[PDB]
């Protein structure tokens, strides 16, 4: 036969090999630190021969030049893992082509960005040699790359770019991308902060955020750009950024629940190479990318891959070939780019935005670069990486290299390049001198943020009977032909009955609170594991057609007024992924993104919220004091000793009470459905942006004593302290009381049952519903109504080192000494775990507490 | 031409055939003239010429029937070829005896579940019904490991089929499982606070049914927190491999202890610890030679559908990042499940890397046996109601093939059921005894009386001299050489600093024959450039570890000891879990994990809460892991200041952990030596210094190492050795850590003979007797203050403010706090604000 047919088969194999694996041979590293193949008779003598390619006939040397330029030069493209052939074709069409050369104006603009990037760092090195700044030197190309992402987003007519990033080049991005004034950055290095800057306890300069407007230089558009605050904990901000962006998209009616699919707010997420591979929150957050409750239409990721993590080499940081391999699980294309090629970096940035816009999905840019100085500017890296730093010492920086290229191209002269550098440096010097001339402020200890936010003087949470009845009737306003599951129908009928006749249970009180807020025009977002039905089969926020699987959400009917006009409200209820860290981070971010939303996250059991401990510690409990960032997220934590074991008993009340300070959070453990209703309505209507932690029930959901009357919803308010109904409404005599039992939560019902069984008129039980801030005035005023009390006990089912005792045992005798001197504890013994593993052992221990309280 | 269509068609089946494979038991979701034409293909024994008809039948059987194979993401062509050779050829047909054995495992699997359903209808058991093939699959993994002559299989798994695996794979007695359902436990079963039945572990010996080998099989305990045990399993296996001299640090590369890790579908996709643990798989400090993963993929997670649980096509897509092949297999085909299990073991043995089996199955009952799944999944449960189980279908096949008769099949099933009934009746006949409250485990482990931790001068000198015993031609970095010279000087002359005291402790243990494993972020050099446990040749990059020289006696014989020091990945959850597991796996090892700053250990909160602080009380599982947490107010911000002492003190109970904040290098040395030599297996939490590493006052004398012991309470040297008068003291300041040096400097500056400073070095268990004895030496004290740099809601005050007046009322009634105000964060963000607040504490203490 004709050997051209054999040779053509080898050409088809070569095309596939470059597309699939060319990235493994690409010249992406700026440091350059690192017989049985069947050729089917193809050799170097076939270079000028024409071959058939899939339609077209091309010379072998031309096929090989296109493949080598696309896949083996300064850009490594990974895309053949993508399922969708139209996405692979889209990328092939754009990378297997001769690129348009940037104009001289575009080249000068890129150089102006590299000048700003390096000169900002060398200026800080000269003025503040002894202060950490986490310089981007060796990775200056991140600045024209980020400029190109934002400029391309503006070109697509998008609304906003929200950035989250770590420390590397943070100050550089704040000054040269977001527009944080140089004077403000210099004031931080000077330690001369005005009262606004010195507010709260604060945080380090490389954790701060900023906002501004980016104005295009090559087009007629502009776009908002924001950079969010973050703690030191690397990658922890990743789900927070997604939540912030989702909330902004929902507000613009763009995105998943929106009237259009523009997803017009773009998350731009930066990462370090060691952190991106090592932190589990990265995979958890990528896992949210296509979920209906969390999708943001694609995140643009940039890894500042300086091939080091402090003193650790990549071989000790990851098991994958690339630090970006984790992102392939959601079908993201990956572009590995040589950080010493500014034009390739800008081109990849624009291609990434175009791909995100075309397919509304994630894209990753792996920018290979290096770290010019030590990990921080006081660290000596040659002790552990002598070879790498001997190579770095021989390298001209990307600014100098690009300047020489433009001089060589004839664009600029050496004198012009020198003058432009002196001008930028001269402007930094001028601003530095002005800041240094400012009057020095006296340094004072930091102050509590407690008084910065206060409840309005007038706020009622009660609703009328018509509102209760409307929410009850919504449960039976089924779509025509809908088949209700036979074991769900009694719940719907019971809700109509409770709305008109009382005995309202916990689950319905929660829906009365959320439904009445929706009717008043509020956006309510509720999510968590199995939250649509409820872990305890109690919520039924979504009901499923038994014959068709169609879904009906009764509370969504409250988003329309009886006359047919919208209230402006909405109910967004989702089953979350099986994640705690990313889910809690996302809801925290969502509440920051839309302060007017009611945002609730529900743990399956409170025992699993320790999986989100970094979010609780670094964002929820402390973001207001550290950054002035406000969140109104609600965490619902099912809690209570019921004999189900040490991981189905406790939400670790003691840990939240320990974290509490400065009125940063509200912490509550309501004992009645109406009090929970009023708590949620107060939180949604008070205009205070502070988190709420609620310890919620499990067996108490179906306790026939734990029900509320209609008048408790229509004629009452949130009560931080509750007395027994016999004293406030009944014929109970407070003067007969000699023993006071103080408690919180479901144990009240067991104590009250024991009091009734033994007719103990000498014992009274007082509940603390709001654990933090402690209701000092209401507690003192309640205790003053029992003048003959000789002894007081704090009673709890939790072990002695858990529950409220560790904080209350110390604080109650200090803040109210005339009431709580001599306060004693009644509880389970101190325990390493939250409870026994045995239901029978739980029952004996529970009875001991009750016997001790009445002994 | 037509051959061009064939080569691309072969690639299409290999790359994407899995997308069309018949893997779901529920089924809820160029020309025809070329068939007899011969084409050239790359056969497994050389180039072959095959009819297109035969190429297509092989590809459809390999990739589109009950097994979906994902492997073309793997970099190594030899691994793809290995898989092709085994999937694109005829599979070995099981013998009739092997088929009957698989059926006996399905019988045991289903009959155990239906028996518990009959006897204990109201108790959760997380049944494997709908996924019974996991039992012959696990049997096949373990049998294939025994066929390779491996030493042990260690299993970690969640709740799904846990009781079934304990009884039918590991050999936990049926009588013990029934006693758990009965709630009639003997005193050993009732020991500690305990845990739920589907969290418990067991160990036994597996004996091959057809071969001549045995193998050890163990299943580790775990909390409810799904996937949290994954890094613990890897640590336990690595410790066992290091002991057998197999694996990464071993003389052979057998990696002869196999991790077998089971997962649920929703948890495997959702929990970040999965990716963190996979990321450890090829790292020198953590590699275990490949984990075999089995996902029990029942296409549901409680009430949540897969479309709400993950963004990837498969729940296993995360594992592709470490190049693991993935085998998706139809759970209703027991022979395909066993065949994939054996293939996975063979692949793990050939390439010493991870393999994933995604077993597609269903969940016969609700999430738990009291839950109604048709409320949320009506369609799925209408389909499940029409399905014959895998046991019934496999029995019908064997009866149909003529392997067994219906009478033989029923007799075998009734024999197993009769034996369950007999054991159940025997357990039910036992008298029920009084149920008592659970008891503290504190007294279970006690320190031997007068444990000596001092070493002689020769030992100190040997460790100092080891720092300059450089290999021939080694070039020391010019800024590292002064540290080595200073260590030799300190070993002979004193003024021993914190960093060298740590290495004196570890070095002296290695010399005594102990394995010491030390790891953490940048731990080889040290975050504060203080450790230099490994030094790097300035010219060649070669590494030298001075403490490794202590593993050889001066006469040249080995001590039996070793120093394993690693830079960890940038992980806290998987790294802490791994070190906890390692300490469980080798109780004789000294295992230390170091946080870069203590502020980041909250990333491992699930491991601290669920394993470290509570595993002894819950499961009787003992760990001696050490956590080193750099801590101290130095003006570096709220994430570079605190290891959250207050949280560890709150978690503390029952003597479960030792918690310490030493103020001197010798006291830290004695703390580490006591921990390594006391024969007690309980974790140690140490709050370690940063600036105090280089404080010239924070140095120790040679006599502090050779003639002393760990001191839980320390007085000022002026009273124990100097000319200080204790009777002049009217104000006592109690403290812990570096603030002691600032308080002592202020006392010396103002000649405050009326003030004494007492340090509590061991925070938990509180040294009640030594504290009382010390305070009794100051008879004229009129006021006592607890002084700390931490905010009032942090540090030791929240626990000590409550416990000291209760446990020592004649000494601490009236105890007052001196500290920073209560704060939402651990500190101010400003170094200047920190400095003003620090001076306020010092001024208040002496005001
Ligand atoms: C381990 C670690 C760093 C190395 C990161 O390497 P890579 O991701 O490649 O980024 P790059 O630095 O190469 O660009 S910087 C950071 C630290 O905390 C600085 C960051 C910060 O505090 O904000 P440090 O004070 O310990 O140095 N640090 C401690 C650390 C540990 N664990 C977590 C979860 N977060 C952290 N901040
Ligand atoms: C969300 C959740 C479960 C669903 C798992 O689905 P999948 O991974 O597909 O497994 P399978 O059940 O389909 O086989 S079972 C488990 C729970 O905790 C039971 C497990 C246990 O407690 O040990 P529960 O009491 O809330 O039901 N539970 C709560 C839970 C939440 N978050 C974590 C980290 N761990 C958990 N145990
Ligand atoms: Mg890096
Ligand atoms: Mg509010
Ligand atoms: Mg499942
Ligand atoms: Mg020990």
Coordinates of C-alpha atoms in Angstrom, one line a residue, chain A residues 5-6 12-13 21 24 38 40 80-85 88 132 190-193 200-204 206-207 230-234 274-275 277-281 283-284 286-294 309-321 325-326 328-330 375 379-387 390 393 443-449 485 487-488 529-537 540 543-549 575-581 604-605 607-614 617-618 621-622 625-627 644-648 652 654-664 801-802 805-807 809-810 825 829-838 840-841 844-845 848, chain B residues 1 4 7-8 16 19 40 42 47 72-77 80 124 182-185 192-196 198-199 222-226 266-267 269-273 275-276 278-286 301-313 317-318 320-322 367 371-379 382 385 432 435-441 477 479-480 521-529 532 535-541 567-573 596 599-606 609-610 613-614 617-618 636-640 644 646-656 793-794 797-799 801-802 806 821-830 832-833 836-837 840:
Chain A
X5 CA -1.6 6.2 4.9
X6 CA 0.7 4.8 7.7
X12 CA -3.4 11.7 14.0
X13 CA -1.7 10.2 17.1
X21 CA -0.2 15.6 27.3
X24 CA 3.7 17.9 30.6
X38 CA 5.6 2.9 16.6
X40 CA 4.4 4.3 11.5
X80 CA -9.2 16.8 27.6
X81 CA -10.7 15.6 31.0
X82 CA -13.8 17.8 30.2
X83 CA -16.9 15.7 29.4
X84 CA -18.6 18.3 27.0
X85 CA -17.1 18.0 23.5
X88 CA -13.0 21.0 24.2
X132 CA 6.6 41.7 57.0
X190 CA 3.8 53.9 60.4
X191 CA 1.4 52.7 63.1
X192 CA -0.3 56.1 63.0
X193 CA -4.0 55.2 62.7
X200 CA -12.4 47.5 67.3
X201 CA -9.5 45.1 68.0
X202 CA -8.4 45.1 64.3
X203 CA -6.2 42.9 62.2
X204 CA -2.9 42.8 60.3
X206 CA -2.3 41.9 54.8
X207 CA -5.8 40.6 55.9
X230 CA -9.9 37.2 55.7
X231 CA -8.1 35.5 58.6
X232 CA -4.6 34.0 58.4
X233 CA -6.3 30.5 58.0
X234 CA -5.4 29.8 54.3
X274 CA 1.0 24.7 49.1
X275 CA -2.4 25.8 50.5
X277 CA -3.2 21.3 47.5
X278 CA -3.3 20.9 51.3
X279 CA -6.5 22.4 52.7
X280 CA -9.7 20.3 52.5
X281 CA -11.9 23.4 52.3
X283 CA -12.3 20.4 47.6
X284 CA -15.4 21.2 49.8
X286 CA -15.3 23.2 44.6
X287 CA -17.9 20.5 45.4
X288 CA -20.5 23.4 45.8
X289 CA -19.9 24.9 42.3
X290 CA -22.7 23.2 40.4
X291 CA -25.2 22.7 43.2
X292 CA -28.6 24.6 42.9
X293 CA -28.3 26.1 46.4
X294 CA -24.7 27.4 45.9
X309 CA 5.4 27.0 50.7
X310 CA 7.6 28.8 53.4
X311 CA 10.5 26.2 53.7
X312 CA 8.6 23.3 52.2
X313 CA 9.3 21.9 48.7
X314 CA 6.3 20.9 46.5
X315 CA 7.3 17.2 46.8
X316 CA 6.4 17.4 50.5
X317 CA 3.2 19.5 50.0
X318 CA 1.2 17.4 47.5
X319 CA 0.8 14.0 45.9
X320 CA -0.6 15.3 42.6
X321 CA 1.4 16.4 39.5
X325 CA -5.4 18.8 40.0
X326 CA -8.2 18.9 42.6
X328 CA -10.4 18.8 37.5
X329 CA -13.2 17.0 39.5
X330 CA -15.7 19.7 38.5
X375 CA 8.9 33.6 52.9
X379 CA 13.4 35.0 56.7
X380 CA 16.6 33.5 55.1
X381 CA 15.5 31.0 52.4
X382 CA 19.0 29.8 51.2
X383 CA 19.3 27.8 54.5
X384 CA 16.7 25.2 53.2
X385 CA 16.6 26.0 49.5
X386 CA 20.2 26.8 48.5
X387 CA 19.9 25.7 44.9
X390 CA 21.3 30.4 43.6
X393 CA 20.0 35.2 42.1
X443 CA -1.9 54.7 71.5
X444 CA -4.7 53.3 73.6
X445 CA -5.9 49.7 74.5
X446 CA -8.5 48.4 72.1
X447 CA -12.2 48.9 72.9
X448 CA -15.1 46.5 72.9
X449 CA -17.5 46.9 69.8
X485 CA -47.8 11.4 50.9
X487 CA -48.0 10.3 56.3
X488 CA -47.3 14.0 55.4
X529 CA -28.3 18.6 55.9
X530 CA -31.8 17.2 55.1
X531 CA -33.3 20.6 56.1
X532 CA -36.1 20.5 53.5
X533 CA -37.9 17.6 55.3
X534 CA -36.1 18.0 58.6
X535 CA -33.7 15.5 60.3
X536 CA -36.5 14.7 62.8
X537 CA -39.2 14.5 60.0
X540 CA -41.7 19.6 55.7
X543 CA -43.3 18.4 50.3
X544 CA -43.0 15.8 47.4
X545 CA -45.8 14.6 45.2
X546 CA -46.2 10.8 46.0
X547 CA -47.0 10.0 42.3
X548 CA -44.8 12.5 40.3
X549 CA -42.0 13.7 42.6
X575 CA -30.7 20.4 51.3
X576 CA -27.0 21.2 51.6
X577 CA -24.0 19.0 50.6
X578 CA -22.5 16.8 53.4
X579 CA -20.2 19.6 54.5
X580 CA -19.9 21.8 57.5
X581 CA -16.8 24.0 56.9
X604 CA -27.9 17.8 61.4
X605 CA -27.0 17.6 65.1
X607 CA -22.3 17.9 67.5
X608 CA -21.1 18.3 63.9
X609 CA -20.6 22.1 63.9
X610 CA -17.0 21.5 65.2
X611 CA -16.3 20.6 61.5
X612 CA -16.7 24.4 60.8
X613 CA -14.7 25.5 63.9
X614 CA -12.3 27.7 61.7
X617 CA -13.6 31.2 65.4
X618 CA -12.2 33.3 62.6
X621 CA -17.4 35.2 66.5
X622 CA -14.7 37.8 65.6
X625 CA -14.1 43.3 66.1
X626 CA -11.3 42.4 63.7
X627 CA -12.5 44.0 60.4
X644 CA -28.3 8.8 71.6
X645 CA -24.6 8.9 72.4
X646 CA -21.7 11.5 72.5
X647 CA -22.1 12.7 68.9
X648 CA -25.9 13.1 69.1
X652 CA -21.0 22.6 72.8
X654 CA -19.7 26.0 76.6
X655 CA -17.5 26.7 73.6
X656 CA -19.8 29.4 72.1
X657 CA -20.2 31.0 75.6
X658 CA -16.3 31.0 75.9
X659 CA -16.0 32.6 72.4
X660 CA -18.6 35.2 73.3
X661 CA -17.4 38.8 74.1
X662 CA -18.3 42.4 73.2
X663 CA -21.9 41.4 72.4
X664 CA -20.5 39.8 69.1
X801 CA -17.2 21.1 82.3
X802 CA -19.9 21.7 79.6
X805 CA -22.1 26.2 84.2
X806 CA -18.4 26.9 83.3
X807 CA -19.3 30.5 82.3
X809 CA -20.7 29.6 87.6
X810 CA -18.0 32.3 87.2
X825 CA -24.2 23.5 90.5
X829 CA -20.1 14.8 86.4
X830 CA -17.3 16.4 84.3
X831 CA -16.8 14.2 81.2
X832 CA -14.3 13.9 78.4
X833 CA -17.1 13.1 76.0
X834 CA -20.5 15.0 75.9
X835 CA -22.4 11.9 77.2
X836 CA -22.4 8.2 77.8
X837 CA -22.8 5.9 74.8
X838 CA -25.6 3.9 76.5
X840 CA -29.8 3.1 79.8
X841 CA -26.8 4.8 81.5
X844 CA -30.0 6.7 85.4
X845 CA -27.8 9.8 85.2
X848 CA -29.9 11.5 89.5
Chain B
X1 CA -9.2 4.8 6.4
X4 CA -8.6 5.2 11.5
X7 CA -8.2 3.1 16.6
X8 CA -10.3 6.1 17.7
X16 CA -15.6 7.0 28.0
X19 CA -20.4 6.6 31.0
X40 CA -4.1 -4.1 13.3
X42 CA -1.7 -3.6 19.9
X47 CA 0.7 -6.7 17.4
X72 CA -7.0 7.0 31.2
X73 CA -6.3 10.0 33.5
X74 CA -3.3 8.0 34.9
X75 CA 0.1 9.5 33.8
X76 CA 2.1 6.1 33.8
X77 CA 1.5 4.2 30.5
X80 CA -2.9 1.8 31.9
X124 CA -31.1 1.8 64.7
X182 CA -30.0 -6.0 74.9
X183 CA -28.3 -3.3 76.9
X184 CA -26.9 -6.0 79.2
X185 CA -23.2 -5.4 79.3
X192 CA -15.7 4.4 80.6
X193 CA -18.5 6.5 79.1
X194 CA -18.5 4.3 75.9
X195 CA -20.1 4.8 72.5
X196 CA -22.8 3.5 70.1
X198 CA -22.0 1.1 65.1
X199 CA -18.7 3.0 66.1
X222 CA -14.5 6.1 65.0
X223 CA -16.8 8.9 65.9
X224 CA -20.0 9.8 64.1
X225 CA -18.1 12.5 62.1
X226 CA -17.9 10.9 58.7
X266 CA -22.6 11.7 50.1
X267 CA -19.8 11.9 52.7
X269 CA -17.9 13.9 48.0
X270 CA -18.7 16.4 50.7
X271 CA -16.0 16.2 53.4
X272 CA -12.7 18.1 52.8
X273 CA -10.7 15.6 55.0
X275 CA -9.0 15.4 49.7
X276 CA -6.6 16.2 52.5
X278 CA -5.6 11.6 49.5
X279 CA -3.1 14.4 49.3
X280 CA -0.9 12.6 51.8
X281 CA -0.8 9.3 49.8
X282 CA 2.6 9.8 48.0
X283 CA 4.3 12.0 50.6
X284 CA 7.5 10.6 52.1
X285 CA 6.3 11.2 55.7
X286 CA 2.8 9.7 55.2
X301 CA -27.4 10.4 51.6
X302 CA -30.3 10.2 54.2
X303 CA -33.0 12.3 52.4
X304 CA -30.6 14.0 50.0
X305 CA -30.3 13.1 46.3
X306 CA -26.8 12.9 44.7
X307 CA -27.6 16.1 42.6
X308 CA -27.7 18.1 45.8
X309 CA -24.6 16.3 47.3
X310 CA -21.9 16.8 44.6
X311 CA -20.9 18.7 41.5
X312 CA -18.9 15.9 40.0
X313 CA -20.2 13.1 37.7
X317 CA -13.9 11.9 41.1
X318 CA -11.8 13.5 43.9
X320 CA -8.4 11.0 40.3
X321 CA -6.1 13.8 41.5
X322 CA -3.6 11.2 42.9
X367 CA -31.7 5.9 56.2
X371 CA -37.2 6.5 59.0
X372 CA -39.8 6.6 56.2
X373 CA -37.9 7.3 52.9
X374 CA -40.9 7.4 50.6
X375 CA -41.8 10.9 51.9
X376 CA -38.8 12.4 50.0
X377 CA -37.9 9.6 47.5
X378 CA -41.3 8.1 46.4
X379 CA -40.0 7.0 43.0
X382 CA -41.4 2.3 44.3
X385 CA -40.0 -2.4 46.2
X432 CA -30.0 -8.2 83.9
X435 CA -27.5 0.1 85.5
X436 CA -25.1 2.6 87.1
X437 CA -23.9 6.1 86.0
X438 CA -20.7 6.0 83.9
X439 CA -17.4 6.4 85.7
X440 CA -14.3 8.6 85.1
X441 CA -11.3 6.7 83.4
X477 CA 25.2 27.1 55.4
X479 CA 24.3 31.2 59.0
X480 CA 23.5 27.6 60.3
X521 CA 4.7 22.7 59.0
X522 CA 8.3 23.7 58.3
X523 CA 9.2 21.6 61.4
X524 CA 12.6 20.4 60.0
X525 CA 14.1 23.9 60.2
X526 CA 11.6 25.3 62.6
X527 CA 9.1 28.2 61.9
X528 CA 11.3 30.5 64.1
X529 CA 14.5 29.2 62.4
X532 CA 17.6 22.8 62.5
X535 CA 20.6 20.8 57.9
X536 CA 21.0 21.2 54.1
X537 CA 24.4 21.1 52.3
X538 CA 24.9 24.7 50.8
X539 CA 26.6 23.3 47.7
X540 CA 24.7 20.0 47.0
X541 CA 21.4 20.1 48.8
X567 CA 7.9 18.8 56.9
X568 CA 4.1 18.1 56.7
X569 CA 1.7 19.1 54.0
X570 CA -0.2 22.4 54.6
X571 CA -2.9 20.5 56.5
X572 CA -4.1 20.5 60.1
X573 CA -7.1 18.1 60.1
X596 CA 3.1 26.5 62.8
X599 CA -3.8 29.5 66.3
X600 CA -4.2 27.0 63.4
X601 CA -4.9 23.9 65.4
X602 CA -8.7 24.8 65.3
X603 CA -8.4 23.4 61.7
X604 CA -8.1 20.0 63.4
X605 CA -11.0 20.6 65.9
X606 CA -12.9 17.4 64.9
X609 CA -12.8 16.8 70.1
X610 CA -13.6 13.3 68.8
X613 CA -9.7 14.4 74.1
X614 CA -12.2 11.6 74.3
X617 CA -13.3 7.2 77.6
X618 CA -15.4 6.4 74.6
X636 CA 1.7 39.7 65.8
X637 CA -2.1 39.8 65.6
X638 CA -5.1 37.6 66.5
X639 CA -3.9 34.6 64.4
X640 CA -0.3 34.6 65.7
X644 CA -6.7 28.6 72.8
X646 CA -9.1 27.9 77.5
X647 CA -10.6 25.4 74.9
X648 CA -8.1 22.5 75.9
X649 CA -8.8 23.2 79.6
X650 CA -12.6 23.1 78.9
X651 CA -12.2 19.8 77.0
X652 CA -10.1 18.3 79.8
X653 CA -11.7 15.8 82.2
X654 CA -10.9 12.4 83.7
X655 CA -7.1 13.0 83.4
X656 CA -7.6 12.3 79.6
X793 CA -12.5 34.9 78.6
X794 CA -9.4 33.1 77.4
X797 CA -8.6 32.2 84.1
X798 CA -12.0 30.8 82.9
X799 CA -11.2 27.4 84.4
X801 CA -11.0 31.2 88.4
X802 CA -13.7 28.6 89.1
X806 CA -13.3 25.2 94.9
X821 CA -10.2 42.6 78.9
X822 CA -12.6 39.9 77.5
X823 CA -12.1 39.9 73.7
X824 CA -13.9 38.4 70.7
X825 CA -10.5 37.8 69.0
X826 CA -7.3 36.5 70.8
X827 CA -5.5 39.9 70.5
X828 CA -5.4 43.3 68.9
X829 CA -4.2 43.5 65.3
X830 CA -1.8 46.3 66.2
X832 CA 1.6 49.2 69.4
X833 CA -1.8 48.5 71.0
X836 CA 0.3 49.4 75.8
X837 CA -2.1 46.6 76.9
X840 CA -1.1 47.8 81.8

